From a paper:
To better understand the intricacies of the reaction, ORN, αKG and GLU were soaked into crystals of holo-AstC. We were also unable to find extra electron density for the ORN soaked crystals, but there was a distinct change in the active site, with the PLP-Schiff base bond to Lys252 clearly broken. This finding is consistent with the completion of the first half reaction (i.e. deamination of the substrate), producing an aldehyde and pyridoxamine. The electron density is set at 1.5 sigma. Figure 5B shows the density for PLP and Lys252 after the crystals were soaked with ORN. The lack of internal aldimine in the ArgD structures is similar to the structure of AstC after soaking with ORN, suggesting that the majority of St-ArgD had undergone a half reaction. SO, ORN and AO were docked into the active site of the structure with PLP covalently bound to Lys252, while αKG was docked into the non-covalently bound pyridoxamine phosphate structure. We see that αKG is positioned with the ketone carbon ready for attack by the amino nitrogen of pyridoxamine phosphate. Additionally, the carbonyl group is stabilized by interactions with Arg141.
[name] possesses two acyl ornithine aminotransferases, one catabolic (AstC) and the other anabolic (ArgD), that participate in L-arginine metabolism. The arginine-succinyl transferase pathway of [name] provides nitrogen for growth via a series of succinylated intermediates. In conclusion, the [name] AstC protein, involved in arginine catabolism, is a PLP containing transaminase that is structurally similar to the related protein ArgD, which is the transaminase enzyme used in arginine synthesis. From the biochemical data, it appears that AstC and ArgD are biochemically similar, consistent with the ability of astC to complement an argD deletion. Both have comparable steady state kinetic values, with a strong preference for the acylated ornithine derivatives AO (AstC and ArgD) and SO (for AstC, at least) over ORN itself.
Numbering used by the authors:
A (entry chain A), B (entry chain B): 3 to 402
């Protein structure tokens, strides 16, 4: 039979309430549903589709590797995964890489590593993880425990112990929870799902200093801010603060499920044979696509084109706002942007987002108070503009 | 750029010591390395590539969805994921499914669901998970804590609490750890990684009765035993015991990263909006490939073919064994097969598997005492007979 939106409510464990309409194909930043209706996509796969939909180069790298082999599992290395490791190593502070299949898997590896590193060098008691309220790090028991949203963790207790949460951008708060017993501090350089809130340069530099004083590993969760999103390859290059461990996923594979953990030689050393692993991680199909993604994103032209796009979005969202008075602030960095709703409209992000979709434009929320834009890094000027026209018309209807 | 095996030792976090040769392509059950050497592949992707390397239909289904769209994140459903969900529902005891990226993510979803379920119907004190010594269920902190190889978890303490391990196949062992505080019992229908140990029928009925008496969810981890592996679509069907949750990954995707949680209506009801999720899970690329795998594997010809192929392997392993006296036993079901080394060859499975690679056959281990075979369910009669000739050669060298 045909497939209907009402099938989703009989067949899926109900953790999501997705859009009333169902996408069937797309190209760059346009996407179309089963009845031909056209959307401009500023969701961008939740900051994943860095190169837009059905990119011809990503396709050709896909079918080219797909016609050789897809997977053997990690008893055997492959050429694409090694080339992909080299690109990441050459391009970042990393000296070594582990590949996995999601952002949570990447953060599981990172927290595992910092645990074993501290145990091995200082002893079993040094196990403290400090993370930040409002953080999101994934949905595995360990990563959702690391996450700063107790409503996502509470139901699944007992939670792994020795995790504590400081207030984001609050140096003294973090300082109070970081002592010689801390093995890791995990922080997103911009909080993503928690509202598109960027770190300040002094906050990060202060976490770097605290980690050094207390021999703790600093982990940047760059799952959302990485691979071009901010206008440098990783947000840490923008802030100018270097972590011991950096995690990466989402846009890494331009839509193919991939993630990775980047590490210094010193940290890498501690993960000996059999101490972590993954069936699919490092397959050559993912690795061929991620390799092409990095080839295309990590160029001066694409990245400066991200800085430029930030200004086309912020200028236009600013003039929409003057006209309609929805938001108190447009914030973020590169093409991760949040519109903060005002006192009159607070908690209403999702209704604006639903209006947007009726008007032909896909936008995200980030908590009930922020409308979040995470479009393709190659969205064209014409796409930004027509998308923002439809968002204008939706703010129109919404504001009454 | 030049790529060599010594690059693996410099670029990769060193959790794997993989083969000294590097695959570059395959077709059916043959694989070829960078120098053109040819291997018969009885490792099967570690029971993932259920239809062999580079399958033309799996590439046609891949290229087809790749050219419409790959990903949106789960704010938007898609036709291939729904169709995949409905195949799974139509073919098993399930009413709903959840999609993720890996068998560990599948098992996280099932262990989370069992905990919330307990908590919501009886109170937050009912949190206990019973697993089995030598089980493998993944590398996330929660799932490696549920698996029964403490060597894989101890470095990463403190572990999530309330987990206990009973002895596999020992119903009194299980009985002593399962009580009214238990939310779940999770078990592999054949322990895979732990030696290719099949469950007995009485053992699995015993856990179903115990879970019934104590109101605990029974979870079959069919990540390895799933999707045709045993000669039935899923092992639980061979055994006539029905779980409350089943997890599936590996061969589900024929090589593409995908996994699923299969649930009855009453368990699915428990995971309400926002209580869980995943960026990549359920994308249409994965669902389009898995959809195709299910279609090609779930037929009476493939599945009976897996019964026939079991006999090819065992008839011939027996005659190798008659010549070299290596194995006390040949065990398993359909195409998961463990050859158990004799006391005179105890702990030498990996050495055997190295010799087999030298002779052009890829095989696995399952602990140091079992040689494991997990080939493609569509492996040909010629490929079986050529691979065993080489495995026989490799046995002869090994015995001197
Ligand atoms: C910053 C950050 N880290 C980790 C994750 C978990 O990623 P995944 O959904 O790929 O498992 C997400 C997803 O929202 C995220 O935004
Ligand atoms: C029975 C079983 N469950 C779960 C897993 C974890 O699967 P993955 O490596 O896909 O995360 C494995 C992998 O070895 C397995 O054999
Ligand atoms: Mg609730
Ligand atoms: Na069913």
């Amino acid at each position: 039979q045909p497939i209907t939106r009402e099938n989703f409510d009989e067949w899926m464990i109900p953790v999501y309430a997705p859009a009333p309409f169902i996408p069937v194909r797309g190209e760059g930043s346009r996407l179309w549903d089963q009845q031909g209706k056209e959307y401009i996509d500023f969701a961008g796969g939740i900051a994943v589709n860095a190169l837009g939909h059905a990119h011809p180069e990503l396709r050709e790298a896909l079918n080219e590797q797909a016609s050789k082999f897809w997977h053997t599992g990690n008893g055997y290395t492959n050429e694409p995964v090694l080339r992909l490791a080299k690109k990441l190593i050459d391009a970042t502070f990393a000296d070594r890489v582990f590949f996995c299949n999601s952002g949570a898997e990447a953060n599981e590896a990172a927290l595992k590593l910092a645990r074993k590193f501290a145990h091995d060098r200082y002893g079993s008691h040094k196990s403290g993880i400090v993370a930040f309220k409002n953080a999101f790090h994934g949905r595995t028991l360990f990563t959702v425990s690391a996450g700063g949203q107790p409503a996502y963790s509470q139901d699944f207790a007992p939670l792994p112990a020795d995790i504590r949460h400081a207030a984001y951008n609050d140096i003294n708060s973090a300082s109070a929870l970081i002592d010689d017993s801390t093995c890791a501090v995990i922080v997103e350089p911009i909080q993503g799902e928690g509202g598109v809130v960027p770190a300040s340069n002094a906050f990060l530099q202060g976490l770097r200093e605290l980690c050094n004083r207390h021999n703790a590993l600093l982990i940047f969760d760059e799952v959302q801010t990485g691979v071009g999103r901010t206008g440098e390859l990783y947000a840490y290059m923008h802030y100018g603060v270097t972590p011991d461990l950096l995690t990466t996923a989402k846009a890494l594979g331009g839509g193919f499920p991939v993630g990775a953990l980047l590490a210094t030689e010193e940290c890498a050393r501690v993960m000996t044979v059999g101490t972590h692993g993954t069936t699919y991680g490092g397959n050559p199909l993912a690795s061929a696509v991620a390799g092409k993604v990095l080839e295309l994103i990590n160029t001066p032209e694409m990245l400066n084109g991200v800085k430029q796009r930030h200004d086309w979005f912020v200028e236009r969202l600013n003039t929409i706002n003057h006209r309609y008075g929805l938001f108190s602030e447009v914030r973020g960095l590169g093409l991760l942007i949040g519109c903060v709703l005002n006192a009159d409209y607070a908690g209403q992000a999702k209704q604006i987002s639903q209006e947007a979709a009726k008007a032909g434009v896909m936008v995200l929320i980030a908590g009930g108070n922020v409308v979040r834009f995470a479009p393709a890094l190659n969205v064209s000027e014409e796409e930004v503009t027509t998308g923002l026209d439809r968002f204008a018309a939706a703010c129109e209807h919404f504001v009454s």
